Design an enzyme around this catalytic site. Structure first.
Site, short mmCIF file in Angstrom:
data_model
loop_
_atom_site.label_atom_id
_atom_site.label_comp_id
_atom_site.label_asym_id
_atom_site.label_seq_id
_atom_site.Cartn_x
_atom_site.Cartn_y
_atom_site.Cartn_z
N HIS A 197 0.73 -1.23 -0.10
CA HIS A 197 0.14 -0.05 -0.11
C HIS A 197 0.82 1.25 -0.16
O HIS A 197 2.15 1.14 0.60
CB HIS A 197 -0.93 0.00 1.21
CG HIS A 197 -2.13 -0.93 1.19
ND1 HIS A 197 -3.22 -0.70 1.62
CD2 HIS A 197 -2.26 -2.10 0.44
CE1 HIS A 197 -4.07 -1.72 1.30
NE2 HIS A 197 -3.41 -2.52 0.74
N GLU A 224 1.44 4.29 1.25
CA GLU A 224 1.89 5.12 2.25
C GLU A 224 2.92 4.27 2.92
O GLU A 224 3.96 4.78 3.41
CB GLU A 224 0.82 5.62 3.08
CG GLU A 224 -0.15 4.50 3.65
CD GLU A 224 -1.28 4.19 2.70
OE1 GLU A 224 -0.99 4.01 1.48
OE2 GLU A 224 -2.59 3.85 2.88
N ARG A 274 6.79 5.66 3.63
CA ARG A 274 7.65 5.69 4.74
C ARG A 274 8.93 4.77 4.59
O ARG A 274 10.12 5.14 5.19
CB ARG A 274 6.88 5.05 5.97
CG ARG A 274 7.63 5.03 7.26
CD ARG A 274 7.22 4.07 8.39
NE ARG A 274 7.20 2.82 8.02
CZ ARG A 274 8.38 2.04 8.53
NH1 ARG A 274 9.12 2.52 9.38
NH2 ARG A 274 8.40 0.79 8.25
N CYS A 331 -6.53 2.61 4.70
CA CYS A 331 -7.45 1.78 4.71
C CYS A 331 -7.68 1.36 6.23
O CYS A 331 -6.67 1.81 7.15
CB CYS A 331 -7.29 0.58 3.98
SG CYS A 331 -5.55 -0.26 4.40
N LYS A 334 13.46 -5.60 3.68
CA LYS A 334 14.32 -5.79 5.08
C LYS A 334 15.61 -6.06 5.04
O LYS A 334 16.39 -5.39 5.62
CB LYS A 334 13.69 -7.29 5.90
CG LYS A 334 12.36 -7.25 6.06
CD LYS A 334 11.69 -8.41 6.46
CE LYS A 334 10.25 -8.43 7.22
NZ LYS A 334 10.43 -7.49 8.27
N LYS A 369 3.68 -10.70 12.00
CA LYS A 369 4.14 -11.85 11.36
C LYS A 369 4.76 -12.68 11.81
O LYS A 369 5.03 -12.91 13.06
CB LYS A 369 5.30 -11.15 10.27
CG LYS A 369 4.56 -10.14 9.35
CD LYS A 369 4.21 -11.13 8.09
CE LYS A 369 3.68 -10.27 6.92
NZ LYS A 369 2.79 -9.07 7.37
O1 LIG Z 1 5.12 -1.71 8.18
P1 LIG Z 1 6.06 -2.12 7.03
O2 LIG Z 1 6.98 -1.16 6.44
O3 LIG Z 1 5.33 -3.19 6.26
O4 LIG Z 1 6.99 -2.98 7.90
C1 LIG Z 1 7.07 -3.23 9.32
C2 LIG Z 1 8.38 -2.95 9.99
O5 LIG Z 1 9.27 -4.24 9.53
P2 LIG Z 1 10.53 -4.19 8.76
O6 LIG Z 1 10.82 -2.42 8.85
O7 LIG Z 1 11.66 -4.90 9.40
O8 LIG Z 1 10.23 -4.35 7.37
C3 LIG Z 1 8.07 -3.27 11.39
O9 LIG Z 1 9.37 -3.25 12.15
P3 LIG Z 1 9.64 -2.02 13.10
O10 LIG Z 1 11.04 -0.98 12.36
O11 LIG Z 1 8.56 -1.12 13.88
O12 LIG Z 1 10.31 -2.80 14.36
C4 LIG Z 1 7.47 -4.59 11.77
O13 LIG Z 1 7.44 -4.66 13.38
P4 LIG Z 1 8.18 -5.95 14.40
O14 LIG Z 1 9.46 -5.34 14.13
O15 LIG Z 1 7.73 -5.57 15.52
O16 LIG Z 1 7.92 -7.37 13.67
C5 LIG Z 1 6.33 -4.95 11.06
O17 LIG Z 1 5.95 -6.38 11.27
P5 LIG Z 1 4.80 -7.02 12.20
O18 LIG Z 1 3.96 -7.66 11.00
O19 LIG Z 1 5.33 -8.08 13.09
O20 LIG Z 1 4.25 -5.92 13.02
C6 LIG Z 1 6.32 -4.54 9.41
O21 LIG Z 1 5.16 -4.61 8.75
P6 LIG Z 1 4.83 -6.07 8.01
O22 LIG Z 1 4.93 -7.35 8.72
O23 LIG Z 1 3.24 -6.01 7.81
O24 LIG Z 1 5.26 -5.58 6.73
ZN LIG Z 2 -3.88 0.45 3.18
#
Ligand SMILES: O=P(O)(O)O[C@H]1[C@H](OP(=O)(O)O)[C@@H](OP(=O)(O)O)[C@H](OP(=O)(O)O)[C@@H](OP(=O)(O)O)[C@H]1OP(=O)(O)O
Ligand SMILES: [Zn+2]
Ligand SMILES: O=P(O)(O)O[C@H]1[C@H](OP(=O)(O)O)[C@@H](OP(=O)(O)O)[C@H](OP(=O)(O)O)[C@@H](OP(=O)(O)O)[C@H]1OP(=O)(O)O
Ligand SMILES: [Zn+2]
Lengths: 396, 397
Positions: free
Chosen positions: A90, A92, A96, A147, A325, A386
Site C-alpha cells: 500500500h 503510504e 515511509r 484503509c 528488510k 508476522k
Molecule cells: O509496516 P512495514 O513497512 O510493512 O514494515 C513493518 C516493520 O518491519 P521492517 O521494517 O523490518 O520491514 C516493523 O518493524 P519495526 O521497524 O517497527 O520494528 C515490523 O514490526 P516488528 O519489528 O515488531 O515485527 C512490522 O511487522 P509486524 O507484522 O510483525 O508488525 C512490519 O510490517 P509488515 O510485517 O506488515 O510488513
Molecule cells: Zn492501506
RNA sequence: UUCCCCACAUUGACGUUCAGUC
RNA sequence: GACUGAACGACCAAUGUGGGGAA
C-alpha cells in the site's frame, strides 16, 4: 464540520490549507517528473503517496523526499525467510520505507566528513546519538484515506458542512483491522485472535497485514524511523497527514491517535503525536481502470524509480527491492560500522540476525508494548504480527 | 530444478518412484471422491487430504487404498477427555495413521479367525516370536501438502541454500522440534526453557502443545507406525514411501523425515532409522488461500461411510467418541489380546487394566522412543513434549 | 444512543471470454 | 510463457443504509 482541517500543536507554524495544498501539489508533481508527465508505462496508479520535508516557513523551501504507488500485499507463497520481499505495498507504507532510505543517507552524510555535517539534517544529541535539526519537519501525503478505521466507514466523499459520524459509539469504531489475503475489506483482529504461523500461511491460511490506519497510528507513537534507526536517532514524527480525497476529520482523528489517548508510561522522548490533519482544496478524481499489480517507489537522490510486483514483493526479474528488510539491514550495518560506539542511543550488543538487532532498540520495543496495551485496554483488539520466522536471517 | 526431484528409498525399491507416486496420489484422491459422492458432499471440503496405500508385489496395480482422511486442526485443551474418548490431533496424516491401525487390528483378527483366513491375512507368524508382515507388503503415505513443522519451514519461491558442508560460519539449527499452537493449523518452535504441561493446568486454558506432523512422522520413521500397543503382537512396521501433493522439497523433507536425527544410536533389534522414498507428484496442487474446515474426515477400508469429527472437541458433532480414539483402539486391542494365545506375544503383559500400563508393556518400543528423544536433544533440536500422565490413566468396560 | 433480525448495498483474490506487448 | 488491458461470472468478511424489533 466533518470536512475540516484539524490543527496540530499549541503554536502554529504553517497555514493549514497552504501546507496541505503544497505537499499535495509537490508529491503529485514529482510523480509527474518521474513518469514523463503521467505518460510512462508505470504511471498507472490507484493510490499515490509521498513524504515532504520542510526546513522552514518558506513554503518554497519544501523538498519531496519520496513518492510511491500501490494497493496490494504479498501473496502467502511468496514470503521470504531471507528478508528479500516487500510484504505490504500500500503506497503510504512504501513511502515511509523510502523515507527510511533517505534517513540512512543523511546519517551516512553526517559521518562522511566535517563539511558534510552542516548539510545533513541530523546533529549530535546531548542525550547521545542523533536528533533532527531544530527546524526540520516531515509531512505524509496519501491521495486517499488509509484503509482501516479512517476509511472503512465512509468510503465516499462527504457532502461538505455535513456533521460527523451519526453512530460514533459502535464497538466497531477504532477497532484494529487487517488487510486479509484473497479477500476484500479490512477486518477486526478480535475475530482472528491467534498468532500467525509460517507453515500455516504456506499451506493456505490467509496472510493478515495490519491496516494502514493502524500502522500510521503506530507511527504516531513509536515514530516513523523504526527500531533499527532508533539505535542511532531520536524518535521522528510526521507533523502532518494530508489526504487528497475521502477526508473525514472525525474518522481520521479517531484513527490516527484519539482512540489510543489512554496510552501511558511511554519511555523518554516518546509520545502520542497529534499531527496536522487535512484534506486538500481540490480533491483528486477516482483513477479509472483496474488496479495495477505493481507498486512504484522513489527516494530523493535516486536516478530511476523502482517497480515491484506487489504479489511477489520483488521486481519483474525477481530481484530484491532496495526497500526490503535485507537492504535496510545492509544500510543499517554499514552505518553501524561507521558510528563511534559512544554515539549509540543503545549500546547493547546483539548477534547479527535481524530480529536480535531490532531487539537491541530496548526503548523502541517498550514504546511498541505501550502501544499494544493501549489498543487492547481500549478494547480495540490485539496487534497481529508476522510469524516469528520472518525476521530470523543474517546477512549471509 | 534439483529441489523438485524424488529422493530414492533406502528400503526395498519395488516400484519406480514417479509411477508409484502418481499411483498412490491418484488412488487416494479417487477414493476420497468415491467416499464423498464425487466431491459434491459437504464433507468433501478440506484443506489437507491424506491417505495410506498398500502394495503387495511389483505389479503397481495390486495397490489398495487402506485409508483416507482430511483435517488441519487440533483439539482445544479445554475439551480433552480423561477417559480417552477424544482425538487429540486431527491433522490428516495423523488420522490416516490411526485409521491404518484399525486396519492392522482387523488383519490380526483375520489371521486368528481360522486357519483358512491365514493365507488371506497380510500377517504371518514370526520366527522371532509374535507376528510380522508377509515378505512383500509395503505401506505408502500420501499427504496433499508437505507435513507441518520442519518440513514446511521454507520459502518455496526461493532457492535452497540451507547448510554448507564446512561448518556453519554462523551457527546451527535447521530441524528444531515444533508444536501445533492451539486454534491453529500452524506451528511454532519448542522453547529451550521448556516447562511441562499439566492436566488441570491445560484444562483451565493454558497452552496445549501437540507435536508437529514433521516430528511425528520422523518418530514413525524410528519407532514404526504401529505404536506401542500393536508392537506387542507385531514387529515394527514402517512406511516405504511418503508422497506429497505440494510444497515438496527434497532437501527440507529429507532433513525432517530422518536426516536431522541421523545421530540416533543403540536402537533395539528390528528398529532402524527408516529412510523411505520421498517424492512429489506430477501435477502439484496449488495453494488455495481461504478458510479451513473445522472438521476432520476419516475412512478405513471395509468401512461403509466416512466418519466426521469436530477437530476442536475431538468428537463428532453430536459428541460421540470416534472409532479412532484411545478408548476405541484399546477396545480393538483388548479383543485381539483375548483371541491371542499367550505364547504368541512379543512382550508379556498379563492383566491389562489401565491404558498407560499396557503401553509400558511394550518394553522395546519404549526403549526406541527413549533413543529418539535423546537423538533430538543431543542434535540440539529441543526436547519432545508429552501429554500429562492423566491422559492415559483409564480402563475399559 | 446501542444492540438484534431481515433485506438491499459498499469494499483483495478466483474463473471465463476478448485484445494487445516482449 | 510471462506480462498487460476491456467485458462477463462467481467468491471473500467486514462495513453502510433502510424497514421491523429490543435494552
Ligand atoms: O509496516 P512495514 O513497512 O510493512 O514494515 C513493518 C516493520 O518491519 P521492517 O521494517 O523490518 O520491514 C516493523 O518493524 P519495526 O521497524 O517497527 O520494528 C515490523 O514490526 P516488528 O519489528 O515488531 O515485527 C512490522 O511487522 P509486524 O507484522 O510483525 O508488525 C512490519 O510490517 P509488515 O510485517 O506488515 O510488513
Ligand atoms: Zn492501506
Ligand atoms: O496419533 P497421535 O495423535 O500422534 O497419538 C499419539 C500416540 O497415542 P495413542 O496411540 O494413545 O493415541 C502415542 O502413543 P504410542 O502409540 O506411540 O505409545 C502417544 O505417545 P506415548 O503414549 O508413547 O506417550 C502420543 O502422546 P504424547 O503426547 O505423550 O506423545 C500421542 O500423540 P498426541 O498426544 O499428539 O495425540
Ligand atoms: Zn500437521
Amino acid at each position: 464540520p466533518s470536512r475540516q482541517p484539524i490543527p496540530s500543536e499549541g503554536l502554529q507554524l504553517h497555514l493549514p490549507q497552504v501546507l496541505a495544498d503544497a505537499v499535495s501539489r509537490l508529491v503529485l508533481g514529482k510523480f509527474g517528473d518521474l513518469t514523463d508527465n503521467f505518460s510512462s508505462p508505470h504511471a498507472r496508479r490507484k493510490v499515490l503517496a509521498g513524504v515532504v520535508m520542510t526546513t522552514g516557513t518558506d513554503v518554497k523551501d519544501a523538498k519531496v523526499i519520496s513518492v510511491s504507488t500501490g494497493t496490494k500485499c504479498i501473496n502467502g507463497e511468496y514470503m521470504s525467510d531471507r528478508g528479500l520481499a516487500l510484504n505490504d505495498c500500500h503506497a503510504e507504507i512504501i513511502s515511509r520505507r523510502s523515507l527510511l532510505r533517505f534517513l540512512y543517507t543523511q546519517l551516512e552524510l553526517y559521518l562522511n566528513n566535517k563539511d558534510d555535517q552542516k548539510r545533513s539534517i541530523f546533529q549530535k544529541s546531548e542525550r547521545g546519538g542523533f536528533r533532527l535539526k531544530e527546524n526540520v519537519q516531515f509531512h505524509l501525503y496519501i491521495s486517499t484515506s488509509p484503509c482501516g478505521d479512517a476509511r472503512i466507514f465512509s468510503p465516499h466523499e462527504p457532502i461538505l458542512e455535513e456533521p460527523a459520524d451519526r453512530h460514533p459509539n459502535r464497538k466497531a469504531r477504532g477497532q484494529l483491522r487487517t488487510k486479509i489475503e484473497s479477500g476484500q475489506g479490512t477486518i477486526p483482529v478480535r475475530s482472528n485472535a491467534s498468532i500467525q504461523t509460517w507453515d500455516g500461511v504456506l499451506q493456505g491460511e490467509r496472510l493478515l497485514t495490519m491496516s494502514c490506519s493502524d500502522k500510521i497510528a503506530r507511527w504516531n507513537v513509536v515514530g516513523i524511523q523504526g527500531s533499527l534507526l532508533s539505535i542511532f536517532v531520536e524518535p521522528i514524527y510526521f507533523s502532518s497527514i494530508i489526504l487528497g480525497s475521502l477526508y473525514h476529520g472525525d474518522h481520521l482523528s479517531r484513527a490516527m491517535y484519539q482512540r489510543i489517548s489512554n496510552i501511558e508510561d511511554l519511555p523518554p522522548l516518546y509520545t502520542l503525536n497529534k499531527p496536522l490533519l487535512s484534506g486538500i482544496s481540490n480533491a483528486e478524481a477516482r483513477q479509472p481502470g483496474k488496479a495495477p499489480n505493481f507498486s512504484v517507489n522513489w527516494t530523493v537522490g535516486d536516478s530511476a524509480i523502482e517497480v515491484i510486483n506487489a504479489t511477489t514483493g520483488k521486481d519483474e526479474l525477481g530481484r530484491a527491492s532496495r526497500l526490503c528488510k535485507h537492504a535496510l539491514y545492509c544500510r543499517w550495518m554499514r552505518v553501524h560500522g561507521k558510528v563511534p560506539s559512544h554515539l549509540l542511543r543503545s549500546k547493547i550488543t546483539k548477534p547479527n540476525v535481524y530480529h536480535e538487532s531490532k531487539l537491541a532498540a530496548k526503548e523502541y520495543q517498550a514504546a511498541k508494548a505501550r502501544l499494544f496495551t493501549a489498543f487492547i485496554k481500549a478494547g480495540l483488539g490485539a496487534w497481529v504480527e508476522k510469524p516469528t520466522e520472518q525476521d530470523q536471517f543474517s546477512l549471509t
